[PDB]
């Protein structure tokens, strides 16, 4: 299964952010990350732990070992707000993390 922390993530434009997930058993590097922009279906960002999905800008990167995997956004831009979800893909069933809502800190 999966645990995602933190739940909310206020961040300023330009800032870096990190969202992590943990699993209950060893899942090698079988892990992906989805962004559900508001009012839309989710979309893929990284799969195979670190591999960037077609079309995703390099501000997103993934990493992780054993149980813990992290998504990092180096320079947060406006389009990146929404809820992120990790999901394991090691053996069925594939289960998703509870989600981390990224909100843009503004004036």
């Amino acid at each position: 299964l999966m645990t995602q922390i933190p739940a909310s993530l206020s961040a300023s434009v330009g800032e870096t952010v990190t969202i992590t997930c943990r699993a209950t058993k060893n899942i090698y590097s079988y892990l992906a990350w989805y962004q559900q922009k508001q009012g839309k279906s989710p979309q893929v960002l990284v799969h195979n732990a670190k591999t960037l999905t077609e079309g995703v800008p390099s501000r997103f990167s993934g990493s992780g070992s054993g149980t813990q995997f992290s998504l990092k956004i180096n320079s947060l831009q406006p389009e990146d707000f929404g809820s992120y979800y990790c999901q394991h893909h090691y053996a069925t069933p594939y289960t998703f993390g509870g989600g981390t809502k990224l909100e843009i800190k503004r004036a």
């Binding site: 809820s83 893909h89 069925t92 594939y94």
Partner: protein
């Protein structure tokens, strides 16, 4: 499609029309509840009809497909109030991990 309001215990069959590709290696059903939580509902390998589900819907939902007409099905039976949610389908590419989008949803509401 196939969604809508249904009274607890009812049954319903959702569909999923694919195009772009003639077949995906795995089609998945995944739902998102009104409180935004995402859940895996089922996965079927068409052309052999193998299936796998969590306990949550085990024995009530039945995923299926038609490699000819390019259709993915979810046949929910004995609906419970907790099945209320948006339902999506996705393909799981071969060397891909989790299941990758192409559905726009379809809201089922059990009340």
């Amino acid at each position: 499609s196939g969604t809508v309001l249904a009274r607890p215990g009812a049954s319903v069959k959702m569909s999923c029309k694919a195009s772009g590709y003639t077949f995906t290696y795995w089609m998945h059903w995944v739902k998102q509840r009104p409180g935004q939580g995402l859940e895996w509902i089922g996965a079927i390998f068409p052309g052999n009809s193998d299936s796998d589900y969590n306990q949550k819907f085990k024995g009530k939902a039945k995923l299926t497909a038609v490699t000819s007409t390019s259709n993915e099905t979810a046949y929910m039976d004995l609906s419970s109030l907790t099945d209320s949610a948006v339902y999506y389908c996705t393909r799981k590419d071969y060397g891909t991990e989790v299941f990758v989008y192409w559905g726009q949803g379809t809201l089922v509401t059990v009340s």
